[PDB]
């Protein structure tokens, strides 16, 4: 049977609210490429032949970006079907609508609109199909995990989970979030079935990828109170089984907040998601061509680097850029068509398309969205966010954690 | 004490070297309360066999501490002199330790120094006084041969490091790490390129040691050394022993790195103390080396292991070398606690002391 | 027909995404077949339009993967073949031509047919190349000889297994650290009883004093006789030059690229750092730069001989062979 | 020397197992591996290597180990009178010598207690009893941060074979609030005045055989099973 | 050296006989009498088989003050061939073969014998117009030597200058 996928584009949360009220989260440029493009590339690379993209919040922009993409071309092997509806509220509603329309016919894929990964789900799919052949209707869902470390920058945030899995047959017996928990509590019934091998895993990075069965949509339709996948997993274990699969030589991560975005971008620029690299140009576009150079230096066409400037570490320079003299750019990504002044020091920054920076600025660990302008003698402290069309005046030093947009009540106004 | 058994089929070129297995040990055929061998010596041999102490100065320090404990627990029998009795008693311990793992040059020098110190004990000296004096001599040796000898080398190597340098290191070395940390603490600003190799992968012991200090460090494997060398300013290498002919005996990936560094006009620097100087000579890694566990070359690439069952193939041999020898013409500078001397002044230091 | 379009797109994505044909011979064969299907399933009045479309296809194929030079080599070979056929049916630069001295708009009917037949011969030559290198085994390997090889090469494997049925010698295989493919070659050689030994790269120099000859292969050969080999091969060449050990290269004719070593910063193939440093290291991965280059550059002065389907040659003659395979106007493609 | 064997029998040690005394089985295990002298803490009626019998007037394991405190001078090897096994003793002390462990216990699989052994199978991280747990199992955060993988076992049988250091004996002697070390001290030692003041960290290791006798008799069924399967044990032993 | 290393090891030995004084045949016979798998060859083939030799071990008549050697003729060619293939060259010589003299006494360093060994007397009338020279010894530079084995152990040539200072006085160099 042809492999299908369900791409939930609309992320029903407000983590990027100052940037979400202007454009959806699945259209934010990670490395000058949209996150939905990364997700579609990951889906097409593993063998998916049909994708159902559900868009609720700002569906027009996502729809036109998809029609302008490569996966919607007549020569593509992964058919993309944009199913937009205006009264979607959570992933449970999307799965209930899928069950109502009967779109899926076999074990499909469940991912979000922002999932950067190069995992090829064939071994996990074969295991999920073989396990469902022995048992009648067991193994309704198989979650994909990645071996990681509790100290890795990508695995230190809200998505920290702890599972109690059977080592003989990989099956999730417990699932909970460690948000603000000094100690974890596990029920004693877990040791009632096997009592031979039961291990508690804390080195699993949640990739938010699932190989599901058509029974998952039916269970979501039955239990109307189910909203997200975590609720379903937590409610199914207390009452069908849920298994898992762990990879150790592939990358997978879902962008959910700002620091997760930073870690994912730093991994993408450092070729950790190979072959998905900025120099590969997997989107097959003419405005995103680039050349790779030593120390992971990504140089686009006609960047016009100035004399005296130094590219020390992993940097990405888009097309149409122009950089002044005596600049120090490191560990940062610069969008296409930017104008940098002189004696500017950029470190761990993220400049989107159309950002203009005057001479004398010092930006460290800050995000500058589209059409952001910085005047002379401006210092941006780490974790400072500048949304679109924000022009910070001169001789002004922003504190740490400064978020300024055109809207009054988010954090601050222009 | 039963002799250790050989494991696997050794290479024809290295058929004169012992090859043991880490899984099997000799403690299976010994007393649980050790009688013939001292319990501290048995613990040290077990740690050497299991690889818990896998350094050069650490092995010497552990051996000297075990010897101090043995001397403290030593009691001279009647009708016998301590000078000969202790020397005759410490020989089976060294034989057992060699059976556990081939001794290093630092351990050999420490054993020789301790034997000389014990033989140089007077007859009229009391037992407790002689034991305390031997312990104090071992402590002074540890202090002025490893601790005090490292500060001088760190101070001598500080004036050779400049701002903006790209130092290339290899494997795990206490002296190199200490030198780099002290140079970064003094105020020198540079970056280090760490080179590693299978199967020990001990270079990661240095990498995470630099990140915790604040030095910008990079990581790569030894087959990709010719790619990063064009940007390397100088190469800092550690030495396990300096032979009397100027050759450097060190980790197997040292002479190769020194040879590839010569083709890129990169100066090669060697750091070693004067207590590791050997009066013997050696021209190749074939006459004297160490054959580690050949089962460490197995790696899981993809789904299966290509070397899962290598004993089934008769004509299949697995070579796992440990040490290698670098000729003196590939070494530019040797840093010791006496000063920055060339690689040809090794016998001179052997003659002065 | 659009079938050719689907085939071209599938081949482009198979080259760009991951690894398709896991052997250079099959890659060259499918490249030649796809070029033949393009020549047949397309309308071109004169040779100019055909050459232009073939050049565009080869350019996009090399843009899909720059390191896979076999596709570009086959494209340039097809271009040269078209050029000879056009020059023959119609009627290099040197000093003689510069002292004693053109467009493809003319149309010919049977020309295409001829071209096809020409491609045909090349096809058959492929299934000879490997054995055309293997049959020259006994001429370069004598009994009781120590031989060292690095990585996994089908050509060197066939060479050794053909030289072992009548001689008996010693073989040492140094496994590459990122991709330990030398273990597979070691097992395949030990399955034939050749007294094979396995070692790491760090010991390549250590045992270099007890090796009589080194025999290796490569991914492609440059125009000046240089090599684009697997990483760690430059160290092996340096060690062989230090001990004056002859270094033999087994490579067929479809591994000759007219390009010169001037495309730095893209010569080596960089893969994910997961092979060198694992992901489970911890928080140190955010301050450590890890690079894993797959290929490396080997200068021509460290090579002794080149064994190909035409026989044994010296590097100082490679410049001629290129001139006998490709046209100077097809170097940039 | 290196160790000091102590066997407590508090009768059962005189039960005929193959027309032989029960306490004869640990004593035979103590021999054939050094141990030219042993300490025996038994009752008054229990009378018969160089055994050093000690007569005890409850008096569990802890207050009996601290009752012979002025007699112990080195690391202790505590066993029980009711124990029949074929284990190679070195396999236990190899975890006590190389790793310099504070505690080395021997256990086996049973053909209630939760044991959180780590991935390597030797280091002991978690050890709790079902009677002490109220409703669920509680695991600290730092333990899971340092060791992300903790394999739990519940069908294990304890052999009461413990190699302990001397400062643990000093702790048991100074603090008279611990009895039945197997149920009170071992979970306290795994939990990491305190013991740190007596040390001049704390590491606990466990060995498992899975293919041996390692049977500590405590009831009628275990006694009859030991009687039934001791024949070829003696055939391989004597 | 070879007959003591052969009672516990087994290796290959090749002996190149000198053309004027073919004394290598006697050593080859003495080695083959002990079963060491000895081979005999000429000097012209010294380079030809040099690619299949792991180590060269020789002796000498005397050692100069700078570490140079006064060896039998044809030894400089052997040293050059060993340096071309980076083959280690070991020298077995006791302590009484150290001379404080330096290579500055040319035209008398080599020992010249009658030309009867090179060209026989029965050649004819061509002996009156042909100059025949038969030097017995030759000079070997110190940079072509790897190690020196003596009764005190193994040393490098770059240390020979010290050993001389430990055996002779600077006022007795000219004698």
Numbering used by the authors:
A (entry chain A): 41 to 279, 285 to 459
B (entry chain E): 167 to 519
C (entry chain D): 8 to 98, 106 to 115, 120 to 351
D (entry chain I): 1 to 10, 24 to 61, 71 to 79, 83 to 136, 155 to 235, 261 to 268, 297 to 334
E (entry chain C): 177 to 351
Task: Copy text from the publication.
Phosphorylated eIF2 (eIF2-P) inhibits translation by binding to eIF2’s dedicated, heterodecameric nucleotide exchange factor eIF2B and conformationally inactivating it. eIF2B is a twofold symmetric heterodecamer composed of two copies each of α, β, δ, γ, and ε subunits. eIF2B can exist in a range of stable subcomplexes (eIF2Bβδγε tetramers and eIF2Bα2 dimers) if the concentrations of its constituent subunits are altered. In this arrangement, eIF2α binding to eIF2B critically positions the GTPase domain in eIF2’s γ-subunit, allowing for efficient catalysis of nucleotide exchange. eIF2B’s catalytically active conformation (“A-State”) becomes switched to an inactive conformation upon eIF2-P binding (Inhibited or “I-State”), which displays altered substrate-binding interfaces. We here provide cellular, biochemical, and structural insight into this question, showing that the SFSV NSs evades all branches of the ISR by binding to eIF2B and selectively blocking eIF2-P binding, thereby maintaining eIF2B in its active A-State.
Refinement of this class resulted in a map with an average resolution of 2.6 Å. After docking the individual eIF2B subunits into the recorded density, we observed significant extra density next to both eIF2Bα subunits, indicating that two copies of NSs are bound to each eIF2B decamer. Interestingly, whereas eIF2α-P forms extensive interactions with both the α and the δ subunits of eIF2B, the NSs mainly interacts with the eIF2Bα subunit. Thus, despite binding to a region known to influence eIF2B’s conformation, an overlay of the NSs-bound eIF2B and apo eIF2B shows that the overall conformation of eIF2B in the two structures are virtually identical. By contrast, the eIF2B–NSs and eIF2B–eIF2α-P overlay shows major conformational differences. The surface of the N-terminal domain forms a hand shape that grips the alpha helices of eIF2Bα, akin to a koala grabbing a eucalyptus branch. In this arrangement, the N-terminal domain extends three loops that contact eIF2Bα. The first two loops sit in a groove between helices α3 and α4 and the third loop just below helix α3, effectively sandwiching helix α3. Together, the three loops extend five aromatic amino acids to contact eIF2Bα. In addition, the side chain of NSs H36 and the backbone carbonyl of NSs T35 both contact eIF2Bδ R321. NSs is an antagonist of eIF2B’s inhibitor eIF2-P, deploying an overlapping binding site. Whereas eIF2-P shifts eIF2B to its inactive I-State conformation by closing the angle between the eIF2Bα and eIF2Bδ subunits, NSs engages the enzyme to opposite effect, binding to an overlapping site with eIF2-P but preserving the angle between eIF2Bα and eIF2Bδ and locking it into its active A-State conformation.
